[PDB]
Amino acid sequence: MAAESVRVAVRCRPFNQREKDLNTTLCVGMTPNVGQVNLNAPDGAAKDFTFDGAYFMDSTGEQIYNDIVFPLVENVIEGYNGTVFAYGQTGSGKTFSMQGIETIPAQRGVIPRAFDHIFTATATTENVKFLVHCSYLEIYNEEVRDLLGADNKQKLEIKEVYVAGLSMHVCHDVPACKELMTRGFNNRHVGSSRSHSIFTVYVEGMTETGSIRMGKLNLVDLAGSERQKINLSLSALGNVISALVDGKSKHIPYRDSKLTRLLQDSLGGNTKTIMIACVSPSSDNYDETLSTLRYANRAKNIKNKPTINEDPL
Secondary structure (H helix, E strand, O other), X not given: OOOEEOEEEEEXXXXXXXXXXXXXXXXXXXXXXXXXXXXXXXXOOEEEEEOOEEEOOOOOHHHHHHHHHHHHHHHHHOOOOEEEEEEOOOOOOHHHHHOXXXXXXXXXXXXXXXXXXXXXXXXXXXXXXXXXXXXXXXXXXXXXXXXXXXXXXXXXXXXXXXXXXXXXXXXXXXXXXXXXXXXXXXXXXOOOOOOEEEEEEEEXXXXXXXXXXXXXXXXXXXXXXXXXXXXXXXXXXXXXXXXXXXXXXXXXXXXXXXXXXXOOOOOOOOOEEEEEEEEOOEHXXXXXXXXXXXXXXXXXXXXXXXXXXXXXX
């Protein structure tokens, strides 16, 4: 019912083989106890930032999920809208935090964890019956496409907010969700750096009193945040966040891109939103990391108004 700011967590990825070979300097510092993130310049001069979560090179998707995503997914199951999106330059770790890996068990991402969590929590609740639906879309060069639809290479129209004609796939267990994510990656545009993608899980709960709640979860993997209408949605996103927090902007320019129009309810609206800002640890990425930290620091101040979406008969 009440005003709720956007939760922001920073996740610094570990060095990569090449950063180790080059003998790259660790310019990023963290003190997770108070969500502190520092960025050291080549001379030593540090820049300090405070976030709701700081995850250093040794962090797992298992610990980020438990701390930040798990209470949001419980909120979704109660009839709330929830949005989790990854922000950061190409290479920073956005996809590793969203999808993750299944050969290091603690490094499974927030997406397959939300599937296991939703299906386990809905199976334990005997006082509410549940219908799970799943959609998956991609926005490349302002062209919205349905990664699950019958014609995966067709542009879609938006009406008000919804993507008019997007397929909503019913899921009866976790493997049904995993089949859509697998088939959705094969429908990505080739003719994954400059495109964005939204995977939504809708949780409809019918209670014994009779009322029905409808909460949805948006799992957003954004395009690379690196400097340079291919970048229209990314520039509009920053402009939207800027308008939302600058205090002078009475009119938020959501209609300036396909991504901002869709995620409009997740930025200032009836949604509990979480941003996962992914950063690289190496000094060769100083400018992009500084850009991402400043951008995520501004996102902290977006004021949403999430309420329970539960209509009684």
